[PDB]
Amino acid sequence: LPEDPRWELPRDRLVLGKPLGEQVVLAEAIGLDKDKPNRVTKVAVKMLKSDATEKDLSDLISEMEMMKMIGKHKNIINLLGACTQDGPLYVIVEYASKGNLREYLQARRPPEEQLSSKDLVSCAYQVARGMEYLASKKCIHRDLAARNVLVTEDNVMKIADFGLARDIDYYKKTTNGRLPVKWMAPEALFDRIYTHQSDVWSFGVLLWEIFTLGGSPYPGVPVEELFKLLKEGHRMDKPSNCTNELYMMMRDCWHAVPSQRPTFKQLVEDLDRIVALTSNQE
């Protein structure tokens, strides 16, 4: 692979640690900042498995290239560097120590600390803000879900896996046992049309995830029945601990007509206003 001095980190500056998932490992980067050479930064490192193919390799390269082009934002997982020469490819990104948003929410359900109502709307605001940034860079996520929102040590929401490329198996489940089709806009599901508007649909489901503290959409509903519910214009029930305003936001994101859904810019503005007016006293 060609070297890119914008992003290259010498392999001996990266102390590999425990696995995070399967491939991703936790690591320590020494002197990530050229300006700051004696500091260690915890980072996440993506790499290929021992059984990887040329196609596997080409995908990793493309995710890394897309991240360079998209640029930095507080509410996405940012590229921090790469080891590309003389050894396996390592793509180094920001580490999110409190896991994904689903996990983060579930672990804070009533019997870590509790989340106020302000906190929950703030999560939504941050994700909307991340997505508005990505939209502005012409990036379409195609699988926006709480599982692909990671949470940092300082509780910042960061959108992950935005830079991946897509081929899709509707019956394939996530490691946690859920079906990705349950976040897909109908035009994306039925006509394989993916847009910013179809991501906004997904964001509506994500909002539902947040206000159910990590609830699972359509529990017990298989793919074939999900199709029928969508064709009949079915819409998930309003969560308890959810204002009428936020529920109408969900329903708007779920407009049958893609052009009538709000944009991410509009959602960021509305959520901004709602955060300020939402109590943190419970």
Curated annotation (Swiss-Prot):
**Modification Phosphotyrosine occurs at:** 170-171, 247
Tissue localization of expression is: Detected in astrocytoma, neuroblastoma and adrenal cortex cell lines. Some isoforms are detected in foreskin fibroblast cell lines, however isoform 17, isoform 18 and isoform 19 are not detected in these cells.
Outcome of residue 187 to K?
In HH2; phenotype consistent with Kallmann syndrome; the patient also carries a rare variant in FLRT3
- The UniProt record gives the binding positions of ATP as 46, 94-96, 100, 147, 161
**Modification after translation, per record:** Autophosphorylated. Binding of FGF family members together with heparan sulfate proteoglycan or heparin promotes receptor dimerization and autophosphorylation on tyrosine residues. Autophosphorylation occurs in trans between the two FGFR molecules present in the dimer and proceeds in a highly ordered manner. Initial autophosphorylation at Tyr-170 increases the kinase activity by a factor of 50 to 100. Ubiquitinated. FGFR1 is rapidly ubiquitinated by NEDD4 after autophosphorylation, leading to internalization and lysosomal degradation. CBL is recruited to activated FGFR1 via FRS2 and GRB2, and mediates ubiquitination and subsequent degradation of FGFR1.
Substituting residue 109 to E results in: Strongly reduced autophosphorylation in response to FGF signaling. No effect on in vitro kinase activity
Active site (record annotation): 143 (proton acceptor)
Give the recorded effect for residue 173 to E: In ECCL; somatic mutation
Enumerate the subcellular locations listed in this protein's record, separating them with semicolons.
Cell membrane; Nucleus; Cytoplasm, Cytosol; Cytoplasmic vesicle
Q: Which residues lie on this side of the membrane: Cytoplasmic?
A: 1-282
Where is each Protein kinase domain found? 14-282
Task: Present the record's domain note.
Answer: The second and third Ig-like domains directly interact with fibroblast growth factors (FGF) and heparan sulfate proteoglycans. Isoforms lacking the first Ig-like domain have higher affinity for fibroblast growth factors (FGF) and heparan sulfate proteoglycans than isoforms with all three Ig-like domains.
Q: What does this protein do?
A: Tyrosine-protein kinase that acts as a cell-surface receptor for fibroblast growth factors and plays an essential role in the regulation of embryonic development, cell proliferation, differentiation and migration. Required for normal mesoderm patterning and correct axial organization during embryonic development, normal skeletogenesis and normal development of the gonadotropin-releasing hormone (GnRH) neuronal system. Phosphorylates PLCG1, FRS2, GAB1 and SHB. Ligand binding leads to the activation of several signaling cascades.
Q: Which family does it belong to?
A: Belongs to the protein kinase superfamily. Tyr protein kinase family. Fibroblast growth factor receptor subfamily.
What do we know about how this protein assembles, alone or with others?
Monomer. Homodimer after ligand binding. Interacts predominantly with FGF1 and FGF2, but can also interact with FGF3, FGF4, FGF5, FGF6, FGF8, FGF10, FGF19, FGF21, FGF22 and FGF23 (in vitro). Ligand specificity is determined by tissue-specific expression of isoforms, and differences in the third Ig-like domain are crucial for ligand specificity. Affinity for fibroblast growth factors (FGFs) is increased by heparan sulfate glycosaminoglycans that function as coreceptors. Likewise, KLB increases the affinity for FGF19, FGF21 and FGF23.
Disease / disorder: Pfeiffer syndrome: A syndrome characterized by the association of craniosynostosis, broad and deviated thumbs and big toes, and partial syndactyly of the fingers and toes. Three subtypes are known: mild autosomal dominant form (type 1); cloverleaf skull, elbow ankylosis, early death, sporadic (type 2); craniosynostosis, early demise, sporadic (type 3). Hypogonadotropic hypogonadism 2 with or without anosmia: A disorder characterized by absent or incomplete sexual maturation by the age of 18 years, in conjunction with low levels of circulating gonadotropins and testosterone and no other abnormalities of the hypothalamic-pituitary axis. In some cases, it is associated with non-reproductive phenotypes, such as anosmia, cleft palate, and sensorineural hearing loss. Anosmia or hyposmia is related to the absence or hypoplasia of the olfactory bulbs and tracts.
Q: What is this protein called?
A: Fibroblast growth factor receptor 1
Q: Which organism is it from?
A: Homo sapiens (Human)
Q: Source gene?
A: FGFR1
Portion held of the full protein: 465 to 765 of 822
